[model samples]
Target: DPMKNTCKLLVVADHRFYRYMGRGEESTTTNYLIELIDRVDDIYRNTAWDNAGFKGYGIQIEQIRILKSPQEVKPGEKHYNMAKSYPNEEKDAWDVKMLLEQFSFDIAEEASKVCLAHLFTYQDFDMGTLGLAYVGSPRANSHGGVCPKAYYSPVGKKNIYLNSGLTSTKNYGKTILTKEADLVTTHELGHNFGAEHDPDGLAECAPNEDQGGKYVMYPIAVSGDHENNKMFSQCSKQSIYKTIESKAQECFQER
Candidate 1:
């Protein structure tokens, strides 16, 4: 069962505009949500980690349970205020954190990890970002971490906030396989597993000047180039393996 090592993911699809009636219509949101899950599953299961001299060790998505009930803001809640006039700059991280707080119950009680997929539009942020994690978790401590939890109640589980709004057709005029939701999902999950920017300009790991752009942890979005962007580098694989070895042993414990 070594190859069966799997990561259980609790996917919370927060339709940010559900309160605005048509904004959160299940018809559109549901389809997109399904696609997102499928894409993530396919990428992780099928992608080969050949860059770092490891070609056979790949991660599996043990399960992706979507929270069918969409979380929305009440009429006069703080979330409602923020949603109405959400800033376009880096401050959006605060907004994302606030949204995650509202779903604290899910984070603490769910699987090994939690991913919040929302439709809220932010001007500056991309598709996905790391959320709360154990104080000393790989992602929480790496590169001085981006979204650290304020309190300590949600023990054991890691969290990631993904903006589905970033999944768009505007960039390529049509949504290609590589530019879909899975791309960002894979990238963010990379952070969860302790992977950093491949060519981050540091001595420990420098970018692959010739082929780094093709790897998943490139730190920027790529479009219309599935052949180039659908893979992970050797360094990324090694870092991810180290993470699962240390923090996510549960992935290989069952099944």
Candidate 2:
């Protein structure tokens, strides 16, 4: 049977910090952003329903609203001009952790209201845990303490930034829309839902392989001459399923 719980999604476009570029391109950042959102929604649904073998948890997509930020906003210039898909933008000096610590409590409060509003309209859907707004930043690499690379966070109170630095220049902006982006976003967000990086090390991937062909949830992005797609590996699929199941249990208890 279906889980009787639902996942709700709300896309908030912070214009003060980022700008949607490529008004003339065949696929504008705005268009890709929307497409990515829809694709993610679909992916989550499929993962929860078809792959995970879970039942009853329904997903309700809220109307995407473009939230305009204040002045002195970080502009996603590259995302608009250089790349194929949307690039992230962020404040010059702010660290994501600080930003979250500063705004997380408040953001959570605001999120509750939004969730309640959704409840009013869709009474039958079991809105499991309310995932806050997915954020996008300007940096190519997230703040890594001192490792080879630092990754952006998508595992705790916040979700992963949809347009952050997971993209490669492999296709430049032409094939900007690829499977890598899908897996990155999925992997990062999955972390927030309690999935951890793949622990089997490079063995998961092939020899001389970066990620060992493991999964995006692997602590580090795969490195190698061979190009990888945006699809999730078998391991990642399992992690996502586990996290979704956990979230379902929690949300159902909340109700």
Candidate 3:
């Protein structure tokens, strides 16, 4: 009976982070999320391949159900202020490292709240297991940026990593909440699917460039006036498929 249906997915959220914006009226984040989801859907319909490879088999993204969480904080709250309580100035390198460790764990705990809700809600999926976390913490180091570990988790077969670092100011006030935010989120999410940084040797505009000018997975964001950086390069597509195969093989062998 289970084999007759594809796997389903539900996206849980602390709250609808940006529900007020309309197509032309909403904030950039709202618009971008909608567009990003739409693009992913498009890839499924036309390409017959999911960046991560599940849909290439029988896994379908049935639904992205967003739910409320118990530890929910309202949007624009400063969750990272808690990190300031630690006296980083007083600590030596070893002490600072310990503090950073604790900080990461704290961030992970905060991040997992959103993920746990989704996992608990979708307990019956048989294909594999739950992965990825989306945390919206206060901007640290820079504005609105996903934690590197957070993206690595889903793609790397690890539990969700902290996505708190994405609250950086550099990202939020500058590019995020603008048209570019969607691309950034997608690129970060792509890391979960095993797309590594485009190695530096690929020539500009070259056919095989993983991060050719506007591809979603580039290590850095483009600056200045740009409306869309939404297309997937051939290199990115290949990288995604490669990750899918690797993930599937690893999973199969583990069983």
Q: CA RMSD for every model?
A: 7.1, 12.8, 12.8
- Is 2 or 3 the stronger prediction by lDDT? 2
Candidate 1's C-alpha lDDT?
Answer: 0.42
For residues 119-231, write the lDDT of model 1, one tens digit per residue: 22212223444223211134433321112223334443445332111222212222234354466656666665556667755543433445444567676654425555666
Worst 10 residues of 1 by lDDT: 162-171
> In model 2, where do residues sit more than 4 Å from their true spots?
1-5, 16-31, 48-52, 55-60, 69-93, 113-180, 202-212, 222-239, 249-255
Assess every candidate by TM-score: 0.56, 0.49, 0.41
lDDT (10s digit) by residue, model 3, range 119-205: 211111112211222322222321111223243344325454432212111221122343443444345445444454454345331
Full candidate order by TM-score, most accurate first: 1, 2, 3
Pick the winner on TM-score between candidates 1 and 2. Answer: 1
Number of backbone clashes in candidate 2: 18
Best first by lDDT, ranked: 1, 2, 3
